[PDB]
Amino acid sequence: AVNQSSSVEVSSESYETIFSQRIIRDLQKELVVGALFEELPMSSKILTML
Amino acid sequence: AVNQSSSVEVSSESYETIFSQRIIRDLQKELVVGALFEELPMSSKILTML
Amino acid sequence: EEDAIFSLLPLLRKRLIEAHAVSIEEAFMTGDGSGKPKGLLTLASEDSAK
Amino acid sequence: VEPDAGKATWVAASTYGTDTTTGEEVKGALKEIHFSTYKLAAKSFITDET
Numbered sequence: 001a002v003n004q005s006s007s008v009e010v011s012s013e014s015y016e017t018i019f020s021q022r023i024i025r026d027l028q029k030e031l032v033v034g035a036l037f038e039e040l041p042m043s044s045k046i047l048t049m050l
Numbered sequence: 051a052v053n054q055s056s057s058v059e060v061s062s063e064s065y066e067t068i069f070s071q072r073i074i075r076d077l078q079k080e081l082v083v084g085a086l087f088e089e090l091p092m093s094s095k096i097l098t099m100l
Numbered sequence: 101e102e103d104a105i106f107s108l109l110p111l112l113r114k115r116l117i118e119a120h121a122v123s124i125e126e127a128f129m130t131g132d133g134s135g136k137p138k139g140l141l142t143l144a145s146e147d148s149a150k
Numbered sequence: 151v152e153p154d155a156g157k158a159t160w161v162a163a164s165t166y167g168t169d170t171t172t173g174e175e176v177k178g179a180l181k182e183i184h185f186s187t188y189k190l191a192a193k194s195f196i197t198d199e200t
Contacts, residue, residue: 003179010111012180015069016104071105073180075152081121083128083140115155119175123158135160 151183 003013040047055061101108131139144150159173 006177008174008177010108010115010178010180012104013182015182019064019066073111073152078118079122079125081125083125084121111152115152115178116175119156119158122156123160126157127160135162 151181153178153181 002016003011005011054065127136127139129139130141131137132142154176155178156176158175159171161170161172165171
């Protein structure tokens with residue numbers, strides 16, 4: 001398997017292989033409802049108007 | 051079974067750590083019979099002594 | 101040697117000489133005479149020095 | 151960490167042609183060893199009034 005040959009030369013089991021420090025990610029769904037509508041600033045708790 | 055390291059979330063997968071390429075071995079046997087007399091040189095595949 | 105430590109030839113020769121060294125020791129300690137020297141432990145049994 | 155390995159085979163004396171029946175070495179399985187770490191933590195306390 002990983003442990004190949006076995007007649008006759010020196011070969012190991014696992015943890016021989018090089019590892020990588022980069023991270024990959026799939027193509028996530030686009031962001032649109034969270035970044036479309038206008039902000040209204042407030043400064044209390046409730047806002048009232050007529 | 052495996053749980054290394056499920057504390058509290060970043061568990062990883064294939065045991066992200068480091069390894070050493072140093073090889074070691076303990077004792078080896080005492081080669082007492084390998085040097086008991088000199089290597090008598092022969093030009094031929096048989097020799098005679100009178 | 102294309103997926104390992106790029107250095108197995110030193111490791112191979114150090115073991116192979118050790119395997120030769122212990123094989124010559126075994127034959128010098130013990131030998132029937134079948135393709136091999138006449139090792140010491142059984143050799144004194146021939147002239148009956150026991 | 152290397153293991154013990156180990157012997158070779160003497161020629162049958164009259165074997166001079168292809169092949170001379172030279173045996174082969176003992177398969178040195180280049181086995182992994184690993185370490186582990188445990189944690190201790192001690193806590194002590196006092197209060198301002200004492």
